[PDB]
């Protein structure tokens, strides 16, 4: 089997991407944030504290003939921005882009933090990291991809995120029309539960490439590119007026700037992020200070190749017995 679904930015800055997902019978369609950095499929639901729902579409298990309470199971997750959610668990039929999994754990939110309530465009998350990170207790649950894998034509999914435009998530096949040149594959460590890999270096603009190993994760659920402070300083030093602002919480730059590109290495191959991809606009409405799309990972504890980086590539998440990651230009 295969599946293919369009993913769409939630706003004009590509702050996140939502993908329609069918849950239950008859289908209830929710727009979920596909997150290769976590491993829980959770949804706003009829069980979510009413004051914490503000415009989201909810899953109502009682209206699904295929929903079953997973008795005794609970979940609770925190994310990198300090947001969180928790609840109980149903199993139900879940389909993405025509690909169907029966018995998928659907984690129903009883509580969500303010950041989730305030974002009316995201109805939940669909985690695509390794199932070892799944938070369901006392019986850990598998991701949608893990459950689908055996049925897939090939044990892969691909992320093809757009810049200020829709893109595609494919399951079970590699669309050879969706990228240019060849795909370069690179090793993955699953030791931390992530799609963790080592970039071979970077360049800033038309500058010379610096060969240096940068360990990090391929994370569709993070907006920006988070890299070591040395790398990030070298980038922003090429932008007149750019500075790290403690009050804003990262590098800012004059909105009048033209940003240089940023290149990262994948083996002997190179992915070029255009400068425009690194512009996240005014820090507040009407400001002439703009927020940068490359930020330091210092104090996160891991480097993160988030959407800023991934949307410059066609990315293969290869879930074969020995997992790997593939990157191509597009």
Swiss-Prot record:
From the record, what ranges are coiled-coil?
A: none
Give the enzyme's EC designation.
Answer: 3.4.23.22
Question: Is Hydrolase given among the entry's keywords?
Answer: yes
Q: Active site: which residues?
A: 35, 199
> A single GO molecular function, which one?
aspartic-type endopeptidase activity
* GO BP terms in the entry: proteolysis
Q: Which reaction does it catalyse?
A: Hydrolysis of proteins with specificity similar to that of pepsin A, prefers hydrophobic residues at P1 and P1', but does not cleave 14-Ala-|-Leu-15 in the B chain of insulin or Z-Glu-Tyr. Clots milk
Q: Which cysteines are joined by disulfide bonds?
A: 255-290
**Source taxon at top rank:** Eukaryota
State whether keyword Protease applies.
yes
Similarity field:
Belongs to the peptidase A1 family.
Q: What is this protein called?
A: Endothiapepsin
| Protein source organism | Cryphonectria parasitica
């Amino acid at each position: 089997s295969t599946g293919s679904a369009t993913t769409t930015p939630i706003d004009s800055l590509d702050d996140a991407y939502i993908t329609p997902v069918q849950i239950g019978t008859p289908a209830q369609t929710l727009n979920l944030d596909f997150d290769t950095g976590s491993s829980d499929l959770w949804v706003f639901s009829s069980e979510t504290t009413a004051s914490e729902v503000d415009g989201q579409t909810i899953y109502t298990p009682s209206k699904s003939t295929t929903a079953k309470l997973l008795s005794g199971a609970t979940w609770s997750i925190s994310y990198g921005d300090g947001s969180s959610s928790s609840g109980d668990v149903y199993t139900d039929t879940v389909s993405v882009g025509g690909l169907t999994v029966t018995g998928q754990a659907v984690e129903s939110a009883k509580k969500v933090s303010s950041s989730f309530t305030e974002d009316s465009t995201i109805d939940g998350l669909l985690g695509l990291a390794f199932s070892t990170l799944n938070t369901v207790s006392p019986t850990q649950q598998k991701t949608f991809f893990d459950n689908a894998k055996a049925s897939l034509d090939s044990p892969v999914f691909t992320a093809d995120l757009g810049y200020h435009a829709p893109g595609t998530y494919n399951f079970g096949f590699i669309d050879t029309t969706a990228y240019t040149g060849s795909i370069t594959y690179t090793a993955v460590s699953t030791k931390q539960g992530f799609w963790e890999w080592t970039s071979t270096g970077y360049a800033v603009g038309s500058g010379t490439f610096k060969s240096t190993s940068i360990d990090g994760i391929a994370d569709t659920g993070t907006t920006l590119l988070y890299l070591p402070a040395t790398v990030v300083s070298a980038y922003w030093a090429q932008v007149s007026g750019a500075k790290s602002s403690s009050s804003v919480g990262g590098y800012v730059f004059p909105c009048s700037a033209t940003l240089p590109s940023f290149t990262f290495g994948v083996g002997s191959a190179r992915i070029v992020i255009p400068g425009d991809y690194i512009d996240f606009g005014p820090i507040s409405t009407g400001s002439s200070s703009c927020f940068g799309g490359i930020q330091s990972s210092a104090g996160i504890g891991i480097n993160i190749f988030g959407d800023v980086a991934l949307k410059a590539a066609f990315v293969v998440f290869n879930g074969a017995t020995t997992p790997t990651l593939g990157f191509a230009s597009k």
